[PDB]
Scaffold this active site. Sequence first.
Site, PDB file in Angstrom:
ATOM      1  N   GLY A   1       0.815  -0.602  -4.986  1.00 57.07           N
ATOM      2  CA  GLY A   1      -0.673  -1.271  -5.058  1.00 57.07           C
ATOM      3  C   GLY A   1      -1.488  -0.879  -6.223  1.00 57.07           C
ATOM      4  O   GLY A   1      -1.625   0.525  -6.381  1.00 57.07           O
TER       5      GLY A   1
ATOM      6  N   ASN B   1      -0.833   2.284   5.879  1.00 58.84           N
ATOM      7  CA  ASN B   1       0.066   1.311   5.097  1.00 58.84           C
ATOM      8  C   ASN B   1       0.846   0.579   6.267  1.00 58.84           C
ATOM      9  O   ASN B   1       1.479   1.104   7.219  1.00 58.84           O
ATOM     10  CB  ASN B   1       1.356   1.720   4.380  1.00 58.84           C
ATOM     11  N   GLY B   2       0.435  -0.691   6.512  1.00 57.27           N
ATOM     12  CA  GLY B   2       1.024  -1.345   7.693  1.00 57.27           C
ATOM     13  C   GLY B   2       0.201  -2.551   7.915  1.00 57.27           C
ATOM     14  O   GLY B   2      -0.641  -3.011   7.009  1.00 57.27           O
TER      15      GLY B   2
ATOM     16  N   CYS C   1       0.827  -1.199  -0.059  1.00 54.45           N
ATOM     17  CA  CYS C   1      -0.004  -0.027  -0.102  1.00 54.45           C
ATOM     18  C   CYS C   1       0.862   1.348  -0.057  1.00 54.45           C
ATOM     19  O   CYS C   1       2.070   1.337   0.186  1.00 54.45           O
ATOM     20  CB  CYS C   1      -0.755   0.019   1.065  1.00 54.45           C
TER      21      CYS C   1
ATOM     22  N   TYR D   1      13.093  -4.596  -3.196  1.00 50.45           N
ATOM     23  CA  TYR D   1      12.236  -4.735  -4.058  1.00 50.45           C
ATOM     24  C   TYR D   1      11.051  -3.588  -4.342  1.00 50.45           C
ATOM     25  O   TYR D   1      10.808  -2.745  -5.144  1.00 50.45           O
ATOM     26  CB  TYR D   1      11.565  -6.000  -4.167  1.00 50.45           C
TER      27      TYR D   1
HETATM   28  N1  LIG Z   1       8.710 -10.514  -4.121  1.00 51.35           N
HETATM   29  C1  LIG Z   1       7.648 -10.183  -5.278  1.00 51.35           C
HETATM   30  N2  LIG Z   1       8.259 -10.390  -6.411  1.00 51.35           N
HETATM   31  C2  LIG Z   1       7.276 -10.070  -7.421  1.00 51.35           C
HETATM   32  C3  LIG Z   1       5.858  -9.699  -7.437  1.00 51.35           C
HETATM   33  N3  LIG Z   1       5.372  -9.606  -8.521  1.00 51.35           N
HETATM   34  C4  LIG Z   1       6.324  -9.607  -9.521  1.00 51.35           C
HETATM   35  N4  LIG Z   1       7.373 -10.135  -8.768  1.00 51.35           N
HETATM   36  C5  LIG Z   1       8.682 -10.674  -9.424  1.00 51.35           C
HETATM   37  O1  LIG Z   1       8.842 -12.033  -9.239  1.00 51.35           O
HETATM   38  C6  LIG Z   1      10.013 -12.569  -8.463  1.00 51.35           C
HETATM   39  C7  LIG Z   1       9.378 -13.410  -7.741  1.00 51.35           C
HETATM   40  O2  LIG Z   1       9.089 -14.550  -8.335  1.00 51.35           O
HETATM   41  P1  LIG Z   1       8.521 -16.321  -7.682  1.00 51.35           P
HETATM   42  O3  LIG Z   1      10.008 -16.826  -7.448  1.00 51.35           O
HETATM   43  O4  LIG Z   1       7.737 -16.009  -6.633  1.00 51.35           O
HETATM   44  O5  LIG Z   1       7.683 -16.822  -8.985  1.00 51.35           O
HETATM   45  C8  LIG Z   1      10.642 -11.248  -8.069  1.00 51.35           C
HETATM   46  O6  LIG Z   1      12.024 -11.197  -8.488  1.00 51.35           O
HETATM   47  C9  LIG Z   1      10.019 -10.042  -8.562  1.00 51.35           C
HETATM   48  O7  LIG Z   1      10.702  -9.242  -9.857  1.00 51.35           O
HETATM   49  C10 LIG Z   1       5.562  -9.400  -5.897  1.00 51.35           C
HETATM   50  O8  LIG Z   1       4.394  -8.925  -5.747  1.00 51.35           O
HETATM   51  N5  LIG Z   1       6.632  -9.781  -4.862  1.00 51.35           N
HETATM   52  N1  LIG Z   2      11.231   2.915 -13.542  1.00 47.99           N
HETATM   53  C1  LIG Z   2      10.315   2.625 -12.693  1.00 47.99           C
HETATM   54  N2  LIG Z   2      10.523   1.672 -12.158  1.00 47.99           N
HETATM   55  C2  LIG Z   2       9.397   1.522 -11.104  1.00 47.99           C
HETATM   56  C3  LIG Z   2       8.203   1.985 -10.971  1.00 47.99           C
HETATM   57  N3  LIG Z   2       7.528   1.571  -9.902  1.00 47.99           N
HETATM   58  C4  LIG Z   2       8.370   0.574  -9.484  1.00 47.99           C
HETATM   59  N4  LIG Z   2       9.549   0.513 -10.020  1.00 47.99           N
HETATM   60  C5  LIG Z   2      10.341  -0.618  -9.958  1.00 47.99           C
HETATM   61  O1  LIG Z   2      10.022  -1.846 -10.766  1.00 47.99           O
HETATM   62  C6  LIG Z   2      10.643  -2.908  -9.848  1.00 47.99           C
HETATM   63  C7  LIG Z   2       9.526  -3.786 -10.349  1.00 47.99           C
HETATM   64  O2  LIG Z   2       9.610  -5.040 -10.211  1.00 47.99           O
HETATM   65  P1  LIG Z   2      10.044  -6.203 -11.200  1.00 47.99           P
HETATM   66  O3  LIG Z   2       8.939  -7.121 -10.968  1.00 47.99           O
HETATM   67  O4  LIG Z   2       9.707  -5.273 -12.560  1.00 47.99           O
HETATM   68  O5  LIG Z   2      11.407  -6.739 -11.378  1.00 47.99           O
HETATM   69  C8  LIG Z   2      10.724  -2.730  -8.530  1.00 47.99           C
HETATM   70  O6  LIG Z   2      12.305  -2.799  -8.176  1.00 47.99           O
HETATM   71  C9  LIG Z   2      10.409  -1.100  -8.300  1.00 47.99           C
HETATM   72  O7  LIG Z   2      11.307  -0.228  -7.867  1.00 47.99           O
HETATM   73  C10 LIG Z   2       7.807   3.180 -11.962  1.00 47.99           C
HETATM   74  O8  LIG Z   2       6.782   3.597 -12.028  1.00 47.99           O
HETATM   75  N5  LIG Z   2       9.054   3.516 -12.843  1.00 47.99           N
HETATM   76 MG   LIG Z   3      12.395 -10.136 -10.279  1.00 54.05          MG
END
Ligand SMILES: Nc1nc2c(ncn2[C@@H]2O[C@H](COP(=O)(O)O)[C@@H](O)[C@H]2O)c(=O)[nH]1
Ligand SMILES: Nc1nc2c(ncn2[C@@H]2O[C@H](COP(=O)(O)O)[C@@H](O)[C@H]2O)c(=O)[nH]1
Ligand SMILES: [Mg+2]
Lengths: 470, 475
Positions: A27, A101-102, A1, A258
């Site tokens: 969120g 948020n919490g 959140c 993350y």
């Molecule tokens: N921890 C976390 N990873 C997410 C989420 N949505 C997408 N991811 C992506 O999924 C990875 C975790 O995947 P898993 O091993 O659960 O299938 C993270 O590296 C992240 O980039 C989320 O809500 N929480």
């Molecule tokens: N550039 C950009 N990065 C974002 C934004 N919102 C979240 N992120 C980054 O997107 C990542 C999402 O994880 P992913 O699952 O794409 O690896 C997170 O590390 C988060 O910091 C956004 O609005 N713009």
């Molecule tokens: Mg990932």
Amino acid sequence: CGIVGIAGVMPVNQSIYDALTVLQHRGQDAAGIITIDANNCFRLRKANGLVSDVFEARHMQRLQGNMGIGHVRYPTAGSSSASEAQPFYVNSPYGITLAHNGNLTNAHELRKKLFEEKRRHINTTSDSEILLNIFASELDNFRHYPLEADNIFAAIAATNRLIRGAYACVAMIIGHGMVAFRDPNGIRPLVLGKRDIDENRTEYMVASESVALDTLGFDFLRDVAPGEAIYITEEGQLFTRQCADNPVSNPCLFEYVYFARPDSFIDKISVYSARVNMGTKLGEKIAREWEDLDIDVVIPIPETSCDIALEIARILGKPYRQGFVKNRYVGRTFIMSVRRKLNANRAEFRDKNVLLVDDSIVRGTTSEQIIEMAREAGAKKVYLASAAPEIRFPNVYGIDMPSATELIAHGREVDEIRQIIGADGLIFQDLNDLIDAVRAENPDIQQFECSVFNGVYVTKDVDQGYLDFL
Amino acid sequence: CGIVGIAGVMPVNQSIYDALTVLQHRGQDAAGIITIDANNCFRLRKANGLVSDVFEARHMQRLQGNMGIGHVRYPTAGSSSASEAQPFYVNSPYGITLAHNGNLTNAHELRKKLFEEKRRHINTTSDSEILLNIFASELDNFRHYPLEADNIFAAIAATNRLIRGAYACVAMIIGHGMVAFRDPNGIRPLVLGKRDIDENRTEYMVASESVALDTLGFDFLRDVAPGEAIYITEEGQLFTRQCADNPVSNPCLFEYVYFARPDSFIDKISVYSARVNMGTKLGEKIAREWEDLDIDVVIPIPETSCDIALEIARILGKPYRQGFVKNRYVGRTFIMPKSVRRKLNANRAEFRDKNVLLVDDSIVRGTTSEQIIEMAREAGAKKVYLASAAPEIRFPNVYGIDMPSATELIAHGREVDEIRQIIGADGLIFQDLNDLIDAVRAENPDIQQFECSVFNGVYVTKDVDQGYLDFLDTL
Ligand SMILES: Nc1nc2c(ncn2[C@@H]2O[C@H](COP(=O)(O)O)[C@@H](O)[C@H]2O)c(=O)[nH]1
Ligand SMILES: Nc1nc2c(ncn2[C@@H]2O[C@H](COP(=O)(O)O)[C@@H](O)[C@H]2O)c(=O)[nH]1
Ligand SMILES: [Mg+2]
Ligand SMILES: Nc1nc2c(ncn2[C@@H]2O[C@H](COP(=O)(O)O)[C@@H](O)[C@H]2O)c(=O)[nH]1
Ligand SMILES: Nc1nc2c(ncn2[C@@H]2O[C@H](COP(=O)(O)O)[C@@H](O)[C@H]2O)c(=O)[nH]1
Ligand SMILES: [Mg+2]
């Protein structure tokens, strides 16, 4: 959140929407905005969906006023994800609304006391409606009108004695103003900023991230201290007062890993910089414990890991290439899996031993499938590096983590995980390494909240009881 | 615009939507999908909006069939942006639908002939409805039913003789099959792929980008040659036939510079790699022509330039840091009684008391650049230098890339230094067209010439220059 609250001297409807859009990563299950018009009446818009889908022109039109709060809700499973969204409201005393948020770890005990002592009905499963009510009942104790800053601080203080867990809140009291407060262990994020319109007028605002102040042109002032409460009157006067018995900074580690945006500065730490640092340390670990490994390139799994992997390549003196591209748009599957999210750039894997870099591995599904994708693209040996340590325990402070059994690392040794996910090699970041990586950005932060990595809950009130209850 | 077509042996409705979601970057103004049911009838759904918003479950449910085509419309200004979306359709002859990415330069001439000669009314401004009509009238000339591949090919060739410009088209003819064809100068992208099911059951598909093939698990076969045409019958038979008089490969340079995805291979060239090369060249150009310039870091302007800047840092031996973050979600700005900061955010720490070299893919009107530079100054940057991965854009693309009017081009009639001044940059430097051409070319030397009208004003097609001369013959 994610939460935001502006105490302006001019319409804030657009500003909140704009602040919520840069906080949308926190969120997307639902969104809500609520203001107070010139008649000291609340105007509210909230529904499930993205910020952009929730607020249409008719809605904005209606959100009149110079003070208001907003909230984007991460689909906290359990709390329906089809349940009533925030911000929440209560007509008495005064008229109160709160966004939060919490998570409260004694939520059950709280709704029982509220029912017995005050006869306050809680309609949802959200422990925020609970928080709002505890806070409302404490304000019910004051006689004179209006309340004075101290009264409001006393109420927050009384509240903090009752509730337990993690929380960054912003609230508004009709005829009084805005209040923003943070839990005693400073877990969930909250920052304060201001914006001077001219010589005599100054607007204030609080948000889960500095990005929200940035995009609105509010000058960043500082993080709201753990246990601290801020009360901004409708006249722009500010008050701050410590409201927790023993405030300590145990900021969530996962925000850095993350959850938070890279351009935000949580508790003086740059998320980007911390992330690069996690690279440096992880590169160094690979270099220590894997010196005899043969890889031809470092490939990041977008987005989080993009600059982390680059650093790792620098440390290992290996080349960095973009083997995966994240689809900018994902469509749903109709009732007529990772491939829909990512695409492998075939040329970068063909006949190469690769090192893939990911921020974490929660369940292992994504990781396994990403690895299959690499093998199908022509990769010989595929190694996986996780920027975060193993995730074996659940978060009960506002990060929605899957069940303990759902966590692949839960009760499994690295190798058993490496096998299940089909990687030729698997390596995780040392918790101590991640800590130093982030800590290096502001050494006054001695400890972090790392329950997900080490089963140690800073609030010391978690056991299988609460867990099983969930 | 972007297109996809799939002649499958099983429902294609989901697969098309999935291919359009990976081609969404090519147009978000509107979308449309159209399939052929078991009863040999078209099922269509087109509306303004994103793929995700246009196709709801009730619609997908209705899109029955094993063959279909799809389109994502880039908001072509002039063509209403609120006008009828593609794919287009006509009931005769046979039943024809056509989706198209590109631009006809003799459109005006074309609707006049159609009206006059065949009485075919064009209801919109889309020259794509024009293209569908020419093709429809030509197929009209055939007596025997069904048409044979050559008849269809003859039709296409006939069509190529008439229209002039750039185009990649996929189409369908009820009771016959899917056809796809590309212009004689091979400008607009189109590729072909297949997905085998058994001893003979094999599906085919064409798309404006290989990504659509990847995502759907189709094996990439090859690009469709300039002027070539492809015809897949409802039975699964593939025919191919050159339908242009003088086919040549003059692929769009801008697809490589910005328009296309990095993971796509257009004409044997990897967009990513072409892009990296652009950095190399530009790095080297900065090193030659700027040597005496002091910078502390190279900072990209997301997203295109991220790896390009990385290379420019490598070449310059300067550090690379992410000073700007692109907002993933942008919202509406309501009208209550487009700001760059709504799209980008500056990471204050990365600019404070530093001289920066910002790398951006191009400068069209100059507004973005100007504001991005202000953002850098407000974040504490001392000197701010801007590098453009693309040469100066001074001309209008009349082949399928929506470019704002030539008056809006900041590069139009201005010297590098005048632009630098207008954008408030401490220094400004563009890529050399020759260097960019080599940069992309290095990936597949068979390409001797690209389409570069935006930069060099040299219009690869016939009718553009001849008409310049017809113009001066009046004043
Ligand atoms: N921890 C976390 N990873 C997410 C989420 N949505 C997408 N991811 C992506 O999924 C990875 C975790 O995947 P898993 O091993 O659960 O299938 C993270 O590296 C992240 O980039 C989320 O809500 N929480
Ligand atoms: N550039 C950009 N990065 C974002 C934004 N919102 C979240 N992120 C980054 O997107 C990542 C999402 O994880 P992913 O699952 O794409 O690896 C997170 O590390 C988060 O910091 C956004 O609005 N713009
Ligand atoms: Mg990932
Ligand atoms: N990762 C990713 N990049 C994309 C996608 N679609 C387009 N792009 C890239 O996005 C860029 C958009 O340019 P920008 O204005 O963001 O610099 C283009 O360079 C284009 O290749 C997509 O779905 N995923
Ligand atoms: N060429 C081009 N650039 C676009 C478009 N939409 C966003 N952009 C971004 O805007 C920049 C050009 O900005 P301008 O100079 O027109 O203000 C490019 O570098 C690119 O990242 C578009 O439709 N065409
Ligand atoms: Mg750009």
